[PDB]
Amino acid sequence: TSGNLGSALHVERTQDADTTVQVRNTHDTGTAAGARFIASNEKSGIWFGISGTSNTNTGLGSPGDAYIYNAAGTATGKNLNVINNQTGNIHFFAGSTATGTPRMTITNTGLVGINTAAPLQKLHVENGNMVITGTAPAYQLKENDTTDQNWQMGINNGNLRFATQNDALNSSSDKVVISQAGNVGIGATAPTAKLEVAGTIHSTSGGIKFPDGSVQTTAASGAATWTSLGLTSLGAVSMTTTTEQSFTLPVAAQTASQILVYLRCHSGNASTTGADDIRIYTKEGAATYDHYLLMFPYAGQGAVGYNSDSFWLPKTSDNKIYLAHSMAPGSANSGCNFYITGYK
Amino acid sequence: TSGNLGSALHVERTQDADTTVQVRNTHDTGTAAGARFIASNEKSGIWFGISGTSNTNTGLGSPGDAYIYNAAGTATGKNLNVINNQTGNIHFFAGSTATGTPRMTITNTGLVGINTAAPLQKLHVENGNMVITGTAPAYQLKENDTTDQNWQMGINNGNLRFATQNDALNSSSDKVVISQAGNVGIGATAPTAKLEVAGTIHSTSGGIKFPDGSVQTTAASGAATWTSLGLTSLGAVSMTTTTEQSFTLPVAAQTASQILVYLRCHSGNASTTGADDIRIYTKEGAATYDHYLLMFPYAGQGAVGYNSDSFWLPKTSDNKIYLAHSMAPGSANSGCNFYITGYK
Amino acid sequence: TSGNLGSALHVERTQDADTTVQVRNTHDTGTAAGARFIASNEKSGIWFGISGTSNTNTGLGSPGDAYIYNAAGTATGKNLNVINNQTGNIHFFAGSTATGTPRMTITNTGLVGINTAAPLQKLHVENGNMVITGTAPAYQLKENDTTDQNWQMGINNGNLRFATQNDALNSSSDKVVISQAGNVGIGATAPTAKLEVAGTIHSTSGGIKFPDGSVQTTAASGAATWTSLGLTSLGAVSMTTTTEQSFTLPVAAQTASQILVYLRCHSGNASTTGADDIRIYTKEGAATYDHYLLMFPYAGQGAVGYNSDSFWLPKTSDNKIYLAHSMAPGSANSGCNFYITGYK
Ligand SMILES: [Cl-]
Ligand SMILES: [Cl-]
Ligand code: NA
């Protein structure tokens, strides 16, 4: 050996010039003219050449085109393999020599760049857009470590559709839609509102701003109208005790948030004298919700005093309402009538 | 014929070895050295070769590179056609022999795979990402069966923009935006809220959860303040009938949801005796909304009883409010005054 | 010269036919059989040929395949350059001759079409889908005029993730997520609601529709329960003036929206006679919020009249509440007690 690291037909000439094997045909008018090299076996073959400037064989291309043609012959299923056993790239230059920008590049590590020789991802389009077309084209994302939990962004009937997809990529399930109108739907598919959500909407912080006056809300709801019950008595009121009196709410209101009650009292020639702050209230455990009505009996008087109030109380879990005299007025010539008149 | 299914220069040798035509140039230092085959017509030609390891002709590549070069000559508009007339693939291998993973594959049915020989879509990037770059690069989706109802996902000024697009792909109309801040806007373009929607937001089910206390709301709105009208009388109250009395609401409140009213009554030496549950109410068709005030005249008495209440009633479509004595108290030494004092 | 615009081995024949240089090997059974052209220098070389139908050299492909093979030799880092110095295209045809649809096209201006010879963008997939696969594959959009303000649509654990990204494409920050469940989150990452927004939600117009009854809301919030204070006196009421009396709200309610107050009055043998419309109100600048309670003293009477009311008033910025007699009733045998009983 020498340690110096450097055929049926062999053409060799050492020179500061291309050593060239040329095939040539200058016939400018023959429909079948051309020049080409062919490598073949007994079944098929591969051709490398250029057609004449009047060549009509569209199987190879247009007149004057160049071609690399792997023929059919009697062979089937054959590949054409383009192989760079090198750490360089495969460069495709079109409309320039190699001094131009490579239109496409396949690096030695598998990356593919369009309009860039240095791709950053497996496919990288430099300084340009991408488009896909069809009757329902979709950009799909297939996750390999999971099973049938894939995604896609597609178009259908002008609606941009974000849909899940299976590992076979053939059973989409629309989850989000945006129409040409600009309306978005999440679980809806014909979004009429600017944003329809077929489900609960949650503000984790901040709450909800409104458009008429930029109203900011982070609470709940209220009311405006109510169901009347007329003068539905809650029971007899004792006039002789200052202890707590309970009353059971009508079944109809046992499902309400608020109840409206009416308390009326009168006193003529009473058996006591003094100010009775009647307390009306509902209970949620320790908490109470409290209203008062004044009843001032004056013993012996030849007249009749009277008072009433109508007010709202929270409807609580125990379905009761309570009443308590601060001073027992007495039943003599006096009265106290307690009614539930509405609920909501 | 035989049924056995199997040139200006013809090189044939049947053998268990490559039959080879070789051109060769070992000049390692010439700036113009190389070896190549050329097929040409009278206008242009195509070269297949390798340059010398000191070749400086950058039109073909870097020193020592291999090349397929379709020349310009005097020909214009010509194609280079790479043709596999076979049901196999076109394989591009870079950095390996054919025993490696094909970097790119073009199947016989038109599918293109990067890093996979078995693509599932027309373009399929196996085990890698895709990126597009520019000053406003966009992934576009063109629908062919429709006319100018296309979509795209682009970037502009750090904002991810989902915009409709025409079949010419040159007139985007932003519909959704997400900023680097993380804010989303639907019909807005400078989203300040975490989610701005230039239009109605609809919860089809579930309603709306809140962040302070996880409040869940599926209703509407209420109030807190109101417009005062002072003591604006609603009209004279008859003291002599138990039939329904109507009164017309002031024009100012005819647009409100609720009205606040004040009813006062007094009775001295009256002409009747008994409990009068005065009923004050508003009407929506069959429905009524009802309050009561007690008035207990006592004939002959040398004193004056008095009562009043101030309360809210729904403002209804007929713009009226009504009053009804359960017992006519009489006008003698007595009075009933009815006022609308506010609305909201 | 003539103005007419039209080698170590030179093969030329002008004819209406291909002028052909052929190399051929019909050995159908040799594991090493093949036919090929080779261009080489002293380090490496490039081969163009076809393998025998029993050729086992997988480095070139499968038996009978055709190949363009840029060899390793003693050369490193070398490119294979495919160059069309023409305004035409580079066409890749697979499964057809050039009369078919080009599977891939590289135009002279750099555009790349799959299944189309006339691409509209730098990369254009005609009548087909695109898919990317991996353990977390992403479609990325890199903006060049800005610095580290890029976007991407990826998949991770079945969740479609819209995340910002840097110009190095290696530090994603999830901003929007959609789960296989169909739930969307903006700033959340495990969306439980159909739409979670970790921040304020803004309706620029239209407001908010609801699902139970299609309720439409564009306002704010209300209440239902409240904090009781019992009978907490607001101060002494003067009985001798019709001028405005102020009272300071308890510190506990100075942070509330509404306050609930209780006013009681009684009158026996008074020193005046007439109707006193006691006015109770809160102030926001010019605006007042007004309730009234009737007190009708009757001088000399041998009885005691009484009245009370309990009602809600807006809690205003000045933390005061006010009271005003329309006629001073007098302190003789009479009383007026004013309490704040609740707030919310
Ligand atoms: Cl009275
Ligand atoms: Cl009262
Ligand atoms: Na009274």
Residue numbers in the entry:
A (entry chain A), B (entry chain A), C (entry chain A): 681 to 686, 694 to 1031
Paper text:
A region comprising N662 to the C-terminus of Bd2133 was determined to 2.5 Å resolution. The Bd2133 tip is 150 Å long, differentiated into three subdomains —two β-helix regions akin to Bd3182 (G683–E813 and N814–A907) and a β-sandwich domain that substitutes for the S74 chaperone (W913–K1031). The latter two domains are linked by a stalk-like linear peptide (A906AGAAT). Equivalents to the Bd3182 capping loops are present, demonstrative of common principles in the S74 and NS74 subgroupings. During Bd2133 refinement, we noticed additional density at the sandwich tip, where the trimer interface creates a pocket using Y985, N956 and N1020. Negative-stain electron microscopy of full-length Bd2133 (residues 21–1,031) confirmed fibre formation, with dimensions commensurate with an AlphaFold18 model and our partial structural determination, showing fibre conformational flexibility.
Bdellovibrio bacteriovorus is a bacterium that preys upon a wide range of other Gram-negative bacteria, entering their periplasm and consuming them from within. Proteomic and structural analyses of vesicle contents reveal several fibre-like proteins, which we name the mosaic adhesive trimer (MAT) superfamily, and show localization on the predator surface before prey encounter. Structural studies reveal a variety of domain usages (and therefore binding capabilities) at the fibre C-termini, placing these on intertwined trimeric β-prisms. Using independent but complementary approaches, we identified and characterized a MAT superfamily of trimeric fibre proteins with diverse adhesive tips, able to fulfil the long-sought-after role of multiplicity of molecular recognition and handling of diverse epitopes (across a wide prey range), by the bacterial predator B. bacteriovorus.
